Amino acid sequence: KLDEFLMLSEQYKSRLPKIRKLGWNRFKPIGINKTMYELEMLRSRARA
Amino acid sequence: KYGPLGITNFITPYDLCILILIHAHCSQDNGISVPTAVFLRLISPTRPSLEWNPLLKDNSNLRSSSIVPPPVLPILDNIIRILLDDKDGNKIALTLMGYLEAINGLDSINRLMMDLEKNCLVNNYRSMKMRTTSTRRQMTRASFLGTFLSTCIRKYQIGDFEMRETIWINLQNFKTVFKHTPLWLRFKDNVHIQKVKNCLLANDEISVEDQQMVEFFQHFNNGNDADSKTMNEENYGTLISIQHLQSIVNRQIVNWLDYEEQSGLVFDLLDTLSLNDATKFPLIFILKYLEAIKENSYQTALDSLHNYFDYKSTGNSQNYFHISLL
Amino acid sequence: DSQDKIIHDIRIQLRKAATELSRWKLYGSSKWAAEALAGLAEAIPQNGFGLSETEYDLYLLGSTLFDAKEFDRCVFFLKDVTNPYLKFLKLYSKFLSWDKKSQESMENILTTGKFTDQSNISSILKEINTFLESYEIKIDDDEADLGLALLYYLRGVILKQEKNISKAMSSFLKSLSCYSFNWSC
Amino acid sequence: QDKIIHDIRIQLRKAATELSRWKLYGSSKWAAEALAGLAPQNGFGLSETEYDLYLLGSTLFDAKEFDRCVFFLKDVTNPYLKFLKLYSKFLSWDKKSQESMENILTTGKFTESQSNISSILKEINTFLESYEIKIDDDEADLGLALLYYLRGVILKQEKNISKAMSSFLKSLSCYSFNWSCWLELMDCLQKVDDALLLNNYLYQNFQFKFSENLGSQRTIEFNIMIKFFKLKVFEELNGQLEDYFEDLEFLLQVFPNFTFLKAYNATISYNNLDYVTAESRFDDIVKQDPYRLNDLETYSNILYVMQKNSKLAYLAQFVSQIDRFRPETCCIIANYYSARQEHEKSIMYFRRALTLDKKTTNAWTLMGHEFVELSNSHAAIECYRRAVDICPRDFKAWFGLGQAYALLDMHLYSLYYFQKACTLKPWDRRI
Amino acid sequence: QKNSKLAYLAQFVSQIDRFRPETCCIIANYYSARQEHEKSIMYFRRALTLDKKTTNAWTLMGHEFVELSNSHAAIECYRRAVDICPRDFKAWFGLGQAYALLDMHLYSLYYFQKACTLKPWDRRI
Amino acid sequence: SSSSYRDSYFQYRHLPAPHHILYAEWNQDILALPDEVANITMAMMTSEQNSNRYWNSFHDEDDWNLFNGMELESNGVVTFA
Amino acid sequence: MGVMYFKKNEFVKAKKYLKKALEVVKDLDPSSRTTISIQLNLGHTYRKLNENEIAIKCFRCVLEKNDKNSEIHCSLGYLYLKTKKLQKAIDHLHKSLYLKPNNSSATALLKNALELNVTLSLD
Amino acid sequence: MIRRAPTTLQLSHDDVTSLIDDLNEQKLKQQLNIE
């Protein structure tokens, strides 16, 4: 039997980072042709 | 103590009552330690899952080797009668009485949630011994109360502001129900309530300006009845989780099959379900089925029996058709 | 001959039926009334209300705050009015405030009803009974206005939602007897 | 006062009823509410064969069946019954007119275009050109003003602000005492030097149609809401004030216990950053009209700076108790979550409130700030941009882009955004 | 039958508005004819939420589970329909079949018997 | 301020139920176009042949025979099979 | 024929024939890709002829006829950049980049506008 | 019979780059006069 509380708890855990993860990938500002997903990629390579 | 019954996946007014007691026990400022028997009667019904097949198995594991007290209904009248019995139980009962009077708002409710998670609850015992500078008792996650409080905290961060508004509306409804009771009159004045209430109300940061209109927001919302009350949706009188409801009915059917119970109270609340909880809680149908056999009703029993096997089979992913026919 | 005379009777009445019902901000019958007149077979405005200029000012405040979805605010300003025409508007604002609130409260709830098959609603019912006794007609009289007939409609519908059948039916008959052509009734 | 206040009562009774009659909820609500603060004339040009269509049109609009109204009034030659169809036809388009990029943030789902209003504007132009009596001379009446007003707002949709002003002022000349008309005129400024130029136009070039209006109202300076026009313009942007204090006092003597004035008067204190006096002015309004919810988000905004979380939580409880789905309610609740450092959830309630109006007060900007604390720095800058497009007069919207681009390596874009906000509010020391 | 016409109606009706109880039942029918069940099942639940009085969508939602080879989910969908109003011949018949498709022939006999009383004058039942 | 006094756009009171905004995603749903998308359900180049056959069914026998393998080149010279 | 004479860099007969075309079609074709195209081409010919004055007005009337177009905005920004009105062209550039994603030439023009704004010190 | 979109041309890359270069000329020479 599927626990309605437990399943809906996982749903909240899934949707919560989704708001923070909004800006990744597709979003592109004006004046910058590269998205912030690879801003942290090159930033990771910067120190390493 | 009667009222409309509804299944809630949120903080029931009953859940905070345990939260009130655990706060007093851990704070150790008042030197009041709640007896272990009190906790085992309150938290244990909330513990998840017991399961019970209709027939083909009778009390295979449901029977407790040691006789247990009946689970407690979610009315402030019934909870106090547990604590009140002791000669010094008035001290324990008043501690819950003062706290429920101290919490006059939703922000105050949030104050209790924040206090427990930051300081009281502790991830593991390895950090327990390094927290010897704590003036309050600390609890491990794996403990009996620790696993309970973790679910309650998880059950608090899960909903939106709509969830917390329903929390405070029902508790005041839950609280004011006890006010119109003979037991409250015996505790109209107890001087110790003011002492314990003022212990937590301190550091309010304002006593001259905000409190005149702080009262106004509550009083206007509350039913002063001076004018027509602000119109709001009908609100349930009692909120119970699935697990707590499971423990009461399982105890009732076992007790019926062969510390005093309340048959009248349990039966009336179970009759006011909104027809969606019955789908989420199929065992309500069979509770009629056992009752139907008692008066030897043929047609009534069959509809309930068929009903119980329509809802149970779908929820359980395993095939249960081979069990329904026999 | 006589059919044409009937035709001549219906448009004027349906002009009246759609006028007050839309003027009193209930759309269950107002929408149907204009629909009926539109499909009627081919063959100066009419208006009247016994309102004083002092209280008629509250009507504009009451009427415009109604369709602006601020039902609760309308009740507060229209609390002290005594005219039966306005008294309906306050309680209708009061009733729909609960109906709209109840819809918001339950959206995850698909099944509606009680398994065995109030106090806030019972609050609305008392003003109806209290006001009805105080007013100096109390139906069963030739001089019975539309507003009092319209008041009985709210009393009937508020009785039905409490599952007090066999009393709302009588109230509905009294309302229809004083004023027919009310589809929502 | 004397007969001046009495003459206002009669004409305001008009503007309360015909505006409510021809389905202008916003304008009529202010006027009707103004009767209560202030200390059945019926008439229209319609025929019996055409009068049924108005009842047919009005009651379907109230039942919110928007699209059916257009079909049932397909061929109407009445001067102003045509307005209700095109007004309904306009909103029927608007509800499905959501820009793709704004919609992504508006919902988070992350998944014929505009030619309709092009036809609507042409339809209005053809009707007025072929209509019997134009706006010139003492002709025209109340209905013709609505057509020009409907024409003006459509022009603003295509960013035709220059012609939008001419249309709106033309409409106000024919019929005054219409509040919804002046609100659209506010968004047409987006500048400071034009306000005095428009002020010069009202004082010299502009003239009223005395035929429709009552006595002592054709004159610009005896008019009471021209003061309301002056109050609104000098609070959105200060600039240089002309007779602002003197005219404010006269309007305060009239209209006793008028909640909108007190809210505007109190809002002035917040714009002056006098927080202690602002709360006292806000508090008196709450006692007088507990069920008034408009501009209560400003009350939440002031409490946010003082961080009186205990009072704010009760404020959120009181507002949400009586209504749970108005834009200011979700905005106040969302503002509450900022106080609890739960910036990640405050987005959801700002998201809900934004969908309610999608043209709000500075709620787009408050949406943007919560992303900054999350370090997205890319949703916020796009979110900040939408506030610029809707209201280019918002200081916080321009400042948000400049502050965010300051964190970004490219500081070149920050100069332009800061320069525009510099002109808007030169008085700020920080900018 | 005539899917081209239904596809025309579904596109046309959805263009007016998607908030009426009906507009969410027309499209689901169009989506059911195309053997796209995981999507058609969605609109029936949607069509009922706007107005809970439309109990006719309960039986259709139950049917749309049977074609998905999901008998467990179907049983509840039919069972709610009779609990809204016991005098539903459609709900009883749809619930009786779901057991008849499985081997539980006698267990479905009661449901068929109940449906008999609703419309006795039918050859099919 | 002034928020609800302007009425120049779709507002929260223009739709009948204010709580319909909770869902607010059904507007952004692309309804399946009438004919050829029905071919993707079976699959879960072929769809275009299916639509071609469907529109090809409206021929007479002799007319279909003539067009059975018919190919038309760009300069207008015609090949008959 | 006008686009033909614009391609050969004659810039005179193209303008003459295009003006003849518009004066033929003054009354009719108010919208629908004919008046917009002809007026945009005449403005484009004027920009090439350095007669920017009539070009600003013609591009402005095309813009008020139809707002959603990246090319018209980019060309208007180019026209303003020919003169010194950077405050009124950068907004057009930003809106043009808002309408269409890449607009590489528009990006270059906007960047140069930033260096211009940086260099200048207007009050 | 249907007409497609008539041929229209926009600012090329060569001319816009030439204008960019010119803009750099008159943004390079004037500060020499200032200095």
Tab-separated table of N, CA and C in Angstrom, chain C residues 60-128:
chain	number	residue	atom	x	y	z
C	60	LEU	N	-24.744	51.726	-4.357
C	60	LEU	CA	-23.622	51.768	-5.289
C	60	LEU	C	-22.361	51.200	-4.654
C	61	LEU	N	-22.105	51.547	-3.391
C	61	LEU	CA	-20.998	50.931	-2.669
C	61	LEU	C	-21.211	49.432	-2.519
C	62	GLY	N	-22.429	49.021	-2.167
C	62	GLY	CA	-22.700	47.603	-2.007
C	62	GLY	C	-22.630	46.839	-3.316
C	63	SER	N	-23.205	47.403	-4.380
C	63	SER	CA	-23.297	46.676	-5.642
C	63	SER	C	-21.934	46.535	-6.306
C	64	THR	N	-21.135	47.601	-6.304
C	64	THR	CA	-19.867	47.565	-7.020
C	64	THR	C	-18.815	46.743	-6.285
C	65	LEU	N	-18.823	46.761	-4.953
C	65	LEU	CA	-17.924	45.893	-4.203
C	65	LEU	C	-18.354	44.434	-4.248
C	66	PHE	N	-19.544	44.142	-4.772
C	66	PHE	CA	-19.999	42.761	-4.866
C	66	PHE	C	-19.273	42.032	-5.989
C	67	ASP	N	-19.422	42.521	-7.221
C	67	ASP	CA	-18.800	41.874	-8.368
C	67	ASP	C	-17.288	42.060	-8.396
C	68	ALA	N	-16.739	42.928	-7.547
C	68	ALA	CA	-15.295	43.073	-7.414
C	68	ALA	C	-14.679	41.992	-6.534
C	69	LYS	N	-15.440	40.944	-6.218
C	69	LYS	CA	-15.042	39.772	-5.443
C	69	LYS	C	-14.746	40.090	-3.979
C	70	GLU	N	-14.905	41.339	-3.540
C	70	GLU	CA	-14.711	41.708	-2.134
C	70	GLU	C	-16.051	41.650	-1.399
C	71	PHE	N	-16.549	40.422	-1.249
C	71	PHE	CA	-17.829	40.214	-0.577
C	71	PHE	C	-17.764	40.603	0.895
C	72	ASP	N	-16.660	40.279	1.571
C	72	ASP	CA	-16.562	40.566	2.998
C	72	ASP	C	-16.594	42.065	3.266
C	73	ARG	N	-15.906	42.850	2.434
C	73	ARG	CA	-15.903	44.298	2.616
C	73	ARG	C	-17.291	44.891	2.424
C	74	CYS	N	-18.083	44.320	1.515
C	74	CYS	CA	-19.442	44.805	1.300
C	74	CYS	C	-20.299	44.626	2.546
C	75	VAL	N	-20.106	43.518	3.263
C	75	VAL	CA	-20.901	43.244	4.457
C	75	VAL	C	-20.648	44.301	5.525
C	76	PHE	N	-19.384	44.689	5.710
C	76	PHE	CA	-19.031	45.617	6.781
C	76	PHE	C	-19.704	46.973	6.598
C	77	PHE	N	-19.683	47.510	5.378
C	77	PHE	CA	-20.289	48.817	5.145
C	77	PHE	C	-21.811	48.755	5.172
C	78	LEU	N	-22.397	47.635	4.749
C	78	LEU	CA	-23.843	47.494	4.638
C	78	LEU	C	-24.441	46.810	5.866
C	79	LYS	N	-23.779	46.933	7.018
C	79	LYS	CA	-24.221	46.221	8.212
C	79	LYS	C	-25.496	46.824	8.797
C	80	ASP	N	-25.575	48.150	8.878
C	80	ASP	CA	-26.623	48.821	9.636
C	80	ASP	C	-27.869	49.138	8.816
C	81	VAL	N	-27.921	48.737	7.545
C	81	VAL	CA	-29.082	49.051	6.723
C	81	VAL	C	-30.280	48.224	7.178
C	82	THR	N	-31.476	48.792	7.012
C	82	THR	CA	-32.707	48.147	7.437
C	82	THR	C	-33.671	47.848	6.298
C	83	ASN	N	-33.460	48.415	5.113
C	83	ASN	CA	-34.370	48.168	4.004
C	83	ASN	C	-34.292	46.704	3.573
C	84	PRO	N	-35.434	46.057	3.330
C	84	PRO	CA	-35.398	44.651	2.892
C	84	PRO	C	-34.660	44.437	1.583
C	85	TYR	N	-34.707	45.408	0.667
C	85	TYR	CA	-33.982	45.272	-0.593
C	85	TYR	C	-32.480	45.154	-0.362
C	86	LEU	N	-31.930	45.998	0.510
C	86	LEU	CA	-30.506	45.950	0.818
C	86	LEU	C	-30.161	44.813	1.771
C	87	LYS	N	-31.076	44.475	2.682
C	87	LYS	CA	-30.828	43.399	3.637
C	87	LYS	C	-30.542	42.083	2.925
C	88	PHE	N	-31.208	41.842	1.793
C	88	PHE	CA	-30.883	40.676	0.978
C	88	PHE	C	-29.457	40.742	0.452
C	89	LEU	N	-29.024	41.921	0.005
C	89	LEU	CA	-27.696	42.036	-0.586
C	89	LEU	C	-26.610	41.714	0.434
C	90	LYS	N	-26.776	42.178	1.675
C	90	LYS	CA	-25.773	41.906	2.699
C	90	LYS	C	-25.654	40.411	2.967
C	91	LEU	N	-26.786	39.738	3.186
C	91	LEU	CA	-26.735	38.307	3.457
C	91	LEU	C	-26.351	37.504	2.220
C	92	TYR	N	-26.749	37.957	1.026
C	92	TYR	CA	-26.269	37.309	-0.192
C	92	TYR	C	-24.763	37.467	-0.331
C	93	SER	N	-24.242	38.643	0.024
C	93	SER	CA	-22.797	38.825	0.068
C	93	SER	C	-22.196	37.910	1.119
C	94	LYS	N	-22.879	37.793	2.257
C	94	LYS	CA	-22.425	36.927	3.334
C	94	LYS	C	-22.437	35.464	2.905
C	95	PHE	N	-23.506	35.034	2.234
C	95	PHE	CA	-23.632	33.636	1.831
C	95	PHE	C	-22.585	33.239	0.792
C	96	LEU	N	-22.430	34.051	-0.259
C	96	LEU	CA	-21.452	33.765	-1.308
C	96	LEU	C	-20.015	33.854	-0.805
C	97	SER	N	-19.761	34.658	0.228
C	97	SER	CA	-18.433	34.671	0.836
C	97	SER	C	-18.083	33.302	1.397
C	98	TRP	N	-19.050	32.631	2.018
C	98	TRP	CA	-18.796	31.290	2.527
C	98	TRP	C	-18.662	30.298	1.376
C	99	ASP	N	-19.539	30.393	0.370
C	99	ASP	CA	-19.481	29.459	-0.753
C	99	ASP	C	-18.154	29.553	-1.494
C	100	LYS	N	-17.674	30.773	-1.748
C	100	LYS	CA	-16.372	30.929	-2.389
C	100	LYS	C	-15.248	30.413	-1.500
C	101	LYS	N	-15.326	30.687	-0.196
C	101	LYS	CA	-14.287	30.227	0.720
C	101	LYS	C	-14.242	28.707	0.794
C	102	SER	N	-15.409	28.061	0.812
C	102	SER	CA	-15.450	26.604	0.887
C	102	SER	C	-14.818	25.970	-0.344
C	103	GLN	N	-15.007	26.587	-1.513
C	103	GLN	CA	-14.391	26.071	-2.730
C	103	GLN	C	-12.871	26.113	-2.643
C	104	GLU	N	-12.316	27.201	-2.105
C	104	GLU	CA	-10.868	27.282	-1.946
C	104	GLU	C	-10.363	26.258	-0.937
C	105	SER	N	-11.141	26.004	0.117
C	105	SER	CA	-10.689	25.112	1.180
C	105	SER	C	-10.466	23.696	0.667
C	106	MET	N	-11.352	23.211	-0.199
C	106	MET	CA	-11.270	21.855	-0.732
C	106	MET	C	-11.106	21.918	-2.248
C	107	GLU	N	-9.946	21.477	-2.735
C	107	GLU	CA	-9.741	21.320	-4.170
C	107	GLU	C	-9.166	19.936	-4.439
C	108	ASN	N	-8.389	19.434	-3.482
C	108	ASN	CA	-7.896	18.064	-3.485
C	108	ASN	C	-8.989	17.063	-3.153
C	109	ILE	N	-10.123	17.534	-2.645
C	109	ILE	CA	-11.211	16.668	-2.214
C	109	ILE	C	-12.123	16.456	-3.418
C	110	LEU	N	-12.125	15.240	-3.970
C	110	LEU	CA	-12.980	14.985	-5.126
C	110	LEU	C	-14.407	14.631	-4.720
C	111	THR	N	-14.572	13.646	-3.843
C	111	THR	CA	-15.902	13.233	-3.414
C	111	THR	C	-16.483	14.243	-2.432
C	112	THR	N	-17.750	14.596	-2.624
C	112	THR	CA	-18.418	15.581	-1.786
C	112	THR	C	-19.636	14.930	-1.151
C	113	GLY	N	-19.794	15.129	0.145
C	113	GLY	CA	-20.919	14.582	0.871
C	113	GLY	C	-20.488	14.209	2.274
C	114	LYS	N	-21.369	13.483	2.954
C	114	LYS	CA	-21.090	12.948	4.277
C	114	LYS	C	-21.296	11.440	4.234
C	115	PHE	N	-20.408	10.701	4.907
C	115	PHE	CA	-20.455	9.243	4.831
C	115	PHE	C	-21.748	8.701	5.419
C	116	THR	N	-22.287	9.363	6.444
C	116	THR	CA	-23.520	8.896	7.062
C	116	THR	C	-24.718	9.034	6.133
C	117	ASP	N	-24.614	9.853	5.091
C	117	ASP	CA	-25.710	10.036	4.149
C	117	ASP	C	-25.588	9.029	3.007
C	118	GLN	N	-22.256	24.399	9.465
C	118	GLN	CA	-23.518	24.313	10.191
C	118	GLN	C	-23.687	25.500	11.131
C	119	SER	N	-22.825	25.572	12.149
C	119	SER	CA	-22.899	26.675	13.102
C	119	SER	C	-22.634	28.007	12.414
C	120	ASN	N	-21.627	28.056	11.540
C	120	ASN	CA	-21.386	29.284	10.794
C	120	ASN	C	-22.558	29.579	9.868
C	121	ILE	N	-23.119	28.543	9.240
C	121	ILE	CA	-24.272	28.751	8.372
C	121	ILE	C	-25.489	29.151	9.193
C	122	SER	N	-25.662	28.536	10.368
C	122	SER	CA	-26.821	28.839	11.199
C	122	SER	C	-26.833	30.300	11.610
C	123	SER	N	-25.659	30.934	11.616
C	123	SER	CA	-25.566	32.358	11.902
C	123	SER	C	-26.321	33.180	10.869
C	124	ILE	N	-26.197	32.817	9.588
C	124	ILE	CA	-26.899	33.498	8.497
C	124	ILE	C	-28.408	33.332	8.621
C	125	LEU	N	-28.855	32.137	8.989
C	125	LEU	CA	-30.282	31.844	9.071
C	125	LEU	C	-30.992	32.715	10.102
C	126	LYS	N	-30.350	32.980	11.242
C	126	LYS	CA	-30.994	33.793	12.272
C	126	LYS	C	-31.308	35.219	11.812
C	127	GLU	N	-30.417	35.880	11.060
C	127	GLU	CA	-30.762	37.238	10.619
C	127	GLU	C	-31.989	37.221	9.722
C	128	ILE	N	-32.123	36.187	8.890
C	128	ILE	CA	-33.304	36.074	8.040
C	128	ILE	C	-34.561	35.981	8.890
